[PDB]
Structures are given as structure tokens and as C-alpha cells.
UniProtKB/Swiss-Prot annotation, chain B:
GO annotation, biological process: tRNA aminoacylation for protein translation
Source taxonomy: Bacteria, Pseudomonadati, Pseudomonadota, Alphaproteobacteria, Hyphomicrobiales
Protein name listed in UniProt: Amino acid--[acyl-carrier-protein] ligase 1
Leftover remarks: Lacks the N-terminal tRNA-binding domain compared to class-II aminoacyl-tRNA synthetases.
Cofactor info, note text: Binds 1 Zn(2+) ion per subunit.
Length: 296, 274
């Protein structure tokens, strides 16, 4: 794989594919990419930082189980009696299996950074005219083990979220599709923006992907990482229509179910794209690129 | 509780006790506290940043299941066939329970930041004279639901780790017991060092029951034996770590100095940038 050779200076193995320790070099680039995205934050955008976990009921309510049940990471623990727990530990001491005593928690590992904002916005009452803007970030989890550096199980997602009228969301999504391209250009990255679909699970998933594809609810900024034939989605421009507005009872300035959209930045994918494109020696990175990332 | 009102300017509810969204105000303070801890990093310290998850087998081998089996957050998923997964979702649609189809993954949510460092160090062969120093950080998880702001289920842990002879670890722990106190003093915090485990305790809820915001943990040759880490003399390596509770230190700052950064002491504002 063309990315493999980057692994030595960027990561350390943690005994699980797509779960790596980040080196000081890798992390300074993720941080500078994070700061760069912050510099493009529109005015009146509320910044929220989410933990790696969220409410299981909120995620169930958002329809994620119907879409990607195979990717979901659910939190599990020993919630039994002291007797039950001591027995589970004893089986583990005796070389047996303690995990049979596991039961689900009321938490899941967040599969996308924006899920938790909708309930938070719903709790504030009706939206003002112009809607609401959020800047969200989270360490996400998707059960997709791979040896490829651009397909992780644990990865950082930064997003700008629009909640409002279909016009508010549409304007936002157009403004962002322009800005996201200017950012990837400034970073010296080769890309193309194309219509796309979410990887919906199963037979129904195929129909759902095809419908989303033609409705143009999803665009992606694709960067060639392993091949020019199969580029990697490093940014997403998603229009949810009134899905979250209806689910959470978010109301427009005009009392209608609110429309939502989000621009997602794959922090780990963008950092890998930078190192693949420009190499592991920062002193050799183009001056324009080094300048925008605050180096020099 | 004396911390409760802090929540308005600090957090947003996420529908689970001890799991909150951080505001821009709270987050800038966590970041500045993180940068401050970095400025005290001794020469030759390797910086590693860990994700919220780690190997389940590595944690099982650490001895954590023996100690706090009730706190451990394991990762579970639907690893069945497409037929089984579609049926699980269908049971949920029909008012049943989809979770019966869950099975454990090979991952856990990390309960302490240092755990993954030991197999990484072990893979490098014998330790040089003087041992190895690491600077690690992770978003940790402990299944301890609470309404108190100083006791979270998802929280940030920053740590400096020493791997070497009992002398290397002892020197390191003496150096950090001093440095940790200088940091808390510089930050204008009221503390007492107590509790082999040191804790730097700060009153947040009460002066009677202060909160452990920093700690030194000595692990003996536990990880050295478990992972086959050999010092320069070929003996099982000893390990120690100084832990900083990022969320607890952020809450301690706001409790001590208030939510208005412009009113924070000039020395405190200076050391944190600002
Ligand atoms: N498994 C992953 N590893 C690393 N980064 C990822 C992964 N999945 C998504 N991302 C990043 O987070 C962004 C937002 O997530 P999104 O739901 O739009 O992804 P996706 O449609 O599943 O992408 P892909 O087709 O590659 O699986 C992506 O554009 C990408 O930049
Ligand atoms: N549940 C928690 N919520 C927030 N921060 C925590 C929590 N547990 C531990 N910490 C922080 O992580 C640091 C190192 O963790 P450690 O295992 O040493 O603490 P602990 O003895 O379990 O603390 P406590 O007695 O309060 O439970 C602590 O010193 C504290 O700063
Ligand atoms: Mg996906
Ligand atoms: Mg504890
Ligand atoms: Zn989103
Ligand atoms: Zn530790």
C-alpha cells in the first residue's frame, strides 16, 4: 500500500488495526490543521467539544442503527451483583471467559461528531431567523478494522453544523463547498469534489445509497491516497433535510421542522493526506503550506 | 454542591451523568493547562497521544479487571452475519432488544492513559541506562456515573511515565512530586499532598473531602514482568507515572478563580498565555 511507508514516523501499533498511537510529528500536524479550520469559522458559530461517548438512546433515536448497525461501537460492562462480578473475574483468573457477564451500558462510542448537537439545539426552543451554527469535534468510532492508514476504527472528526430553514442549510452548504476547496488548495492537496453516498448497511442500504446519491444529499472532497482510481473521502458535505428536525422536534423561525446540514473534516485523513503529499520532513514542505499552518 | 453553578458556563448535558459537552470557555482552559504541563516536560521525553480505545487483551494483562472490574468500559458490536444484524435491528423496530446480538470486541475504552505504553516500550528491546521517559495522553473512561463535576465517566488524563530501574523511577517520582506542587502553586491553587501512591488534593466540593487532581502511581516491576521489559542490567523493569486530571484541574481553576478569565490573577493569566 502507498501509505504504509508513512507509518514509521506517524504511528505506533496498539495491537489493533486502525487503532494507533500518534507520534509528536503527526500530532503537531493534526493540531495545525485543527487551528486552520478554526480560522475559517464564521461569526456566531457556537463551539462544542464532545467526549468519545454519547447517549445510546439519543443515537438509537437518530436512526443510526437502521443505517450502519455493523459500524456501531456500544459500551459494555459488568453491571451485575458483587457475586456475579467476582465470579466473572474468577473465571478470568482461571483462564476462562469473563466477557459472558458483559451487558450493554446506556452509552455508545460516537460514530459521528454532530449527533449530540441536535438534542442540545432542540432544548433551546424555536430557532432564531438565520438558524443556528455549531462547530463540533469528537473522537469517533466505526467498527471497520483495516490495515490501511486512511481507514481507522478510532479517528477525529471536526464539523461545522447548520440548523435552520432549507435556505439557511443550502446557503451554508454552498459557502462550505467553496471554502473547503480553497482550504485543500491552500494545503497543496490534489482533490475532486463528487456526488456521494453513505455506506448504508445491507440490501436496503443499497437502495438508500442510490436514493441519497441522486437526491445529492452528500458531496465528498476526494484525495488520491492509495490510487487515483479509488481516492479517499477527506471531507463531506451532508444535507439531512428535516430528518433531525423531525426526530428532535427542532422548529424553524417559521415554526416548520428544521432542516440540518454539516461539513465534516476527517482530521486523521487530512493529516495522512498532508504527509503522503508533502512527506515526513516539515522543513521541506512548500512555503505557502508552511505559512498557512503557522510554521516559519 | 459548590461546583454546580459552574456547569452553565462550562458544560452542556448529553443525557448521561459525567458525560458532558465542553463549551469554548472550558476547552480553552483545558488546552492552556495542557500546554503548561508540556512546558515542564524533561529532555528526552517521547510524546505519544493515544485514542479513547486500547487493546482488551493488553488491559486484561495489566491487571485492571482484577482491581476495578465494575469501572471498565468494554467495546461491543454486532459482529454477526448480515441476516443476524438485520434481525437485531428488526427486533428493535418491533419493540424488542437489539443488544442480545452484541458480542465483545478486542477493544476497551482506556481507564488510564499509560496502559498502552508498556507493550510499545517492550517491543524496543532492553532499556538504555537511565531508562525511558514518555509523555502520554488519552480520553479515559471509568463507569462511575455521578452528578458531581469532579467525577466524570469520560475524562482527559495526561501523564509522564518513567520505565527503568527502581532508582530511575524513585528519582523521577521525587522530581515530579516537587514539579507538580510548583505547577499547582503557579496556577494559584490550594492543595495538600497525601496518601505507594501520592495525590495532590484540591478542595472543590468541600475542604473536608478534597479532590485528587494529580497522582503518582508506583507499579513496582508489574509491567516489566508482564511485558518482559528489561532494564540496562537485565532485570525486570520498574515503572512509575505522574497523572494529571485535565478535567479536574480545569474545574479546580474555574472554582478557584471564577468563570471570568479577565479577572484571573496576572501571574496565572501569564503562565497560561492569555
Ligand atoms: N474509518 C475512517 N477512518 C478515518 N477517517 C474516517 C473514517 N470514516 C470517515 N472518516 C472521515 O470522517 C469524515 C466524515 O465521515 P462520513 O460519515 O462522511 O464518512 P464515510 O462516508 O463512511 O467515508 P468512507 O466512504 O471512506 O467510509 C469522512 O469524510 C472522512 O474524512
Ligand atoms: N472519574 C474521574 N473523573 C474525572 N477525573 C478523574 C476521574 N478519576 C480519576 N480522575 C483523574 O485522573 C487522575 C489519575 O487517575 P487515578 O487512577 O490516579 O485516580 P483515582 O485514585 O481513581 O481518583 P479518585 O479517588 O478521585 O477516584 C486523578 O489523579 C484525577 O486527576
Ligand atoms: Mg462509513
Ligand atoms: Mg477512582
Ligand atoms: Zn455530521
Ligand atoms: Zn498511569
Amino acid at each position: 500500500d502507498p501509505l504504509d511507508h508513512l507509518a514509521d514516523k506517524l504511528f505506533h501499533s496498539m495491537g489493533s488495526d486502525g487503532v494507533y498511537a500518534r507520534t509528536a510529528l503527526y500530532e503537531s500536524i493534526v493540531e495545525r490543521l485543527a487551528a486552520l479550520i478554526t480560522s475559517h469559522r464564521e461569526a456566531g458559530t457556537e463551539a462544542l467539544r464532545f467526549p468519545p461517548v454519547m447517549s445510546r438512546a439519543q443515537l438509537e433515536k437518530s436512526g443510526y442503527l437502521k443505517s450502519f448497525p455493523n459500524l456501531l461501537g456500544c459500551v459494555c460492562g459488568l453491571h451485575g451483583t458483587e457475586r456475579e462480578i467476582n465470579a466473572a473475574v474468577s473465571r478470568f483468573d482461571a483462564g476462562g471467559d469473563w466477557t459472558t457477564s458483559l451487558s450493554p451500558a446506556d452509552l455508545v462510542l460516537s460514530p459521528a461528531a454532530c449527533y449530540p448537537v441536535y438534542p442540545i439545539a432542540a432544548s433551546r426552543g424555536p430557532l432564531p431567523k438565520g438558524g443556528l451554527r455549531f462547530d463540533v469535534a469528537a473522537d469517533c468510532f466505526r467498527r471497520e478494522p483495516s490495515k490501511h492508514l486512511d481507514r481507522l476504527q478510532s479517528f477525529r472528526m471536526r464539523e461545522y453544523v447548520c440548523i435552520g430553514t432549507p435556505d439557511d442549510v443550502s446557503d451554508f452548504r454552498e459557502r462550505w463547498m467553496v471554502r473547503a476547496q480553497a482550504i485543500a488548495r491552500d494545503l497543496g492537496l490534489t482533490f475532486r469534489v463528487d456526488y456521494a453516498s453513505d455506506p448504508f448497511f445491507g440490501r436496503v442500504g443499497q437502495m438508500k445509497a442510490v436514493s441519497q446519491k441522486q437526491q445529492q444529499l452528500k458531496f465528498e472532497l476526494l484525495i488520491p491516497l492509495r490510487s487515483e482510481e479509488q481516492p479517499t473521502a477527506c471531507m463531506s458535505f451532508n444535507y439531512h433535510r428535516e430528518h433531525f428536525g423531525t426526530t428532535w422536534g427542532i422548529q424553524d423561525a417559521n415554526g416548520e421542522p428544521a432542516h440540518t446540514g454539516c461539513v465534516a473534516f476527517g482530521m486523521d485523513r487530512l493529516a495522512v493526506a498532508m504527509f503522503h503529499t508533502h512527506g515526513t520532513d516539515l522543513s521541506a514542505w512548500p512555503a505557502k503550506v508552511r505559512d498557512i499552518l503557522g510554521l516559519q
